[PDB]
Amino acid sequence: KKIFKPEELRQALMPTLEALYRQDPESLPFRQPVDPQLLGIPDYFDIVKNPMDLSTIKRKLDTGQYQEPWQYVDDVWLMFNNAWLYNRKTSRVYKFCSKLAEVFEQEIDPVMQSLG
Amino acid sequence: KKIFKPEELRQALMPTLEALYRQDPESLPFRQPVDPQLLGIPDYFDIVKNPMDLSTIKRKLDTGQYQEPWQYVDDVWLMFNNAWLYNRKTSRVYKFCSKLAEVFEQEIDPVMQSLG
Ligand SMILES: Cc1noc(C)c1-c1ccc2c(c1)nc([C@@H]1CCCC(=O)N1)n2[C@H]1CC[C@@H](NC(=O)OC(C)(C)C)CC1
Ligand SMILES: Cc1noc(C)c1-c1ccc2c(c1)nc([C@@H]1CCCC(=O)N1)n2[C@H]1CC[C@@H](NC(=O)OC(C)(C)C)CC1
Ligand SMILES: [Mg+2]
Numbered sequence: 001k002k003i004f005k006p007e008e009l010r011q012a013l014m015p016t017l018e019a020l021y022r023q024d025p026e027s028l029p030f031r032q033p034v035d036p037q038l039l040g041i042p043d044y045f046d047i048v049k050n051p052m053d054l055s056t057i058k059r060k061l062d063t064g065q066y067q068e069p070w071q072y073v074d075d076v077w078l079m080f081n082n083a084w085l086y087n088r089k090t091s092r093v094y095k096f097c098s099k100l101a102e103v104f105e106q107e108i109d110p111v112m113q114s115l116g
Numbered sequence: 117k118k119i120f121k122p123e124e125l126r127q128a129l130m131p132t133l134e135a136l137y138r139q140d141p142e143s144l145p146f147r148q149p150v151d152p153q154l155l156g157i158p159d160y161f162d163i164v165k166n167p168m169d170l171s172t173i174k175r176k177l178d179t180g181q182y183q184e185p186w187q188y189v190d191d192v193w194l195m196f197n198n199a200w201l202y203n204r205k206t207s208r209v210y211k212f213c214s215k216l217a218e219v220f221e222q223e224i225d226p227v228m229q230s231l232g
Contacts, residue, residue, distance in 0.1 A: 046134075047134050047137075047138075049138050049140070050140060077148075081137075081147050081148075081171075084171065084174070085134070085137055085174065088178050089175060089178040089179060090178070
């Protein structure tokens with residue numbers, strides 16, 4: 001039944017995104033979209049058909065593109081699954097992604113309990 | 117008596133797993149282990165005694181846990197059989213599983229032929 005007010009969603013959810021940004025160095029690969037030309041990885045978009053990154057999620061929060069909090073959680077989880085799929089378990093970026101996922105899991109659980 | 121090296125298997129088999137990940141929305145329930153507490157299905161682990169999902173399979177490919185290609189195929193097929201067993205034929209999840217199974221059959225057929 002409930003309609004989420006855009007600023008209510010933004011206020012509840014942005015602290016969880018801000019917690020990811022504070023992770024340095026782990027958030028740095030995730031602060032802007034993956035650029036396969038800069039990185040020299042022409043197969044990236046062969047494998048990742050739905051790219052996502054922190055700046056895109058932040059812009060969707062700013063502009064009211066999320067109707068309900070699970071749409072935001074789905075984008076954060078998509079971001080992580082893209083990096084875990086494309087990069088090997090031993091790689092730096094994969095370990096960075098796991099650290100962000102660890103932080104996100106700790107932040108998001110009490111927030112979603114209070115929203116639903 | 118051919119020996120299959122970890123990286124050899126990974127290069128051959130990873131594309132077939134990547135093809136499943138590309139299916140959206142159908143791969144989304146399969147990208148992480150089933151969480152019966154999150155989903156509110158407490159009998160899940162009564163029926164599924166050997167859970168399996170894409171992220172676990174990907175990890176086993178990354179870490180060399182498959183000795184031969186059929187061990188990978190067996191895990192993908194276990195994944196599917198778990199979903200078809202637990203969910204009814206008319207359910208969304210079951211239909212999503214069938215879609216992944218159709219993609220997998222098309223992708224694995226030539227790969228297995230080239231490996232043997
Ligand atoms: C995620 C992901 N998933 O797969 C992959 C693959 C990634 C991913 C993405 C970015 C990565 C990254 C891995 N490795 C690094 C760096 C550089 C190379 C290797 C290294 O060791 N450290 N970067 C940086 C690239 C550009 C930087 N900023 C940026 O573009 O500055 C402007 C001014 C706008 C030009 C910041 C981040
Ligand atoms: C397979 C299978 N076999 O039996 C069953 C049963 C499944 C199965 C499994 C997952 C399912 C699923 C069915 N239905 C959905 C969604 C939500 C439920 C209602 C719906 O209509 N669609 N999900 C999602 C659950 C959580 C999602 N992500 C996730 O955990 O995010 C973090 C951040 C880590 C918390 C991704 C997938
Ligand atoms: Mg953990």
